[model samples]
Target: AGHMQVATSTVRILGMTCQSCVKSIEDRISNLKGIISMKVSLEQGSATVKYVPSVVCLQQVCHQIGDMGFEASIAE
Candidate 1:
């Protein structure tokens, strides 16, 4: 297999209006099977996730976050 640099994505989350909501969403995203790392910012309403493209895709990322009862979309 060819080597590739891990990709990082910034996700904008909706319905996260408090710290607890951020924590919950973060906890869920952190546990995704292919995620390498993640950071959720309550003030920014965004999450930056580092992951392997071979194991996961952007749509899967958004779907996983959405499954946690929060709305998420790719930032760009």
Candidate 2:
């Protein structure tokens, strides 16, 4: 069982207007290589991501959202 290094992170997002925006973010983030799960909160304006750190970095994940035309930043 040497594969338990998954990490959890939160990304604050801006420019999402509705449920569809949540869906869009979730769909794309989930398709990323190392993402184990993705949850976006429209009310909270953020996303929680579970991913394999060795396979993907947090900044890369944030940039993916940024490339999608949304403002994304690592949550404090």
Candidate 3:
């Protein structure tokens, strides 16, 4: 929608391994709800996502990450 605006959130991740973990998280939410962009850093153990707030909620994003077998929390 032309009237939609993007929102961003940061997630503190736990239990991520190598590239597979990155890919796993990527594949898990890259097309879920309002996800516009996702960037993950294994070294930093965090994920930042830019999405349409109207289509997705931060709680759902956190839940999705946990559902993928990792612990997640809202971060700065």
Candidate 4:
């Protein structure tokens, strides 16, 4: 059996005007294949996420956020 690989990452977000934007991002990203857990901080303008790299990549997550009309970038 192979071991599962999980990665934790933080994504910086821009253009969030209200709390709803945070909710939208949390809802959308949580549904993706690799996402294990997520938390969006409106004050910090970032999202912390745990996901399986084999199932998804950081670029795809950023793309999804971009699709929602928000700017996304890796925190590091």
Q: lDDT per prediction?
A: 0.69, 0.68, 0.70, 0.70
Please give, for residues 1-76, the per-residue lDDT of candidate 3 as tens digits: 3326877667887764545555666776766755677788666778777777778676777776677777788765
Give per-residue CA lDDT, model 4, range 1-76, as digits (tens). Answer: 0226867778887874646556666666767755677777667778787677677776778787677787778864
Tens digits of per-residue lDDT for model 2, 1-76:
2236877767777774545555665666667765567677666777777777777677777766677777777763
* TM-score of candidate 2 versus the correct structure, residues matched by position: 0.69
Tens digit of per-residue lDDT, candidate 1, span 1-76: 1328677778888874546556665665566676677777767778787777777666776776577677777864
Q: Report the error of model 4 at residue 16, Å.
A: 4.6
Q: Candidate 3 local accuracy as lDDT?
A: 0.70
Please give the lDDT score at residue 59 for candidate 2.
Answer: 73
Query: What C-alpha RMSD separates each model from the true structure?
Result: 3.4, 3.8, 3.8, 3.6
* Top candidate when judged by TM-score against the true structure: 4
The true-versus-predicted C-alpha distance at residue 42 of model 3, in Å, is 1.9
TM-score of each: 0.65, 0.69, 0.69, 0.71
Off by over 4 Å in 3: 1-4, 16-21
- What TM-score should be assigned to candidate 1? 0.65
Q: Give the Å shift of residue 53 in candidate 3.
A: 1.4
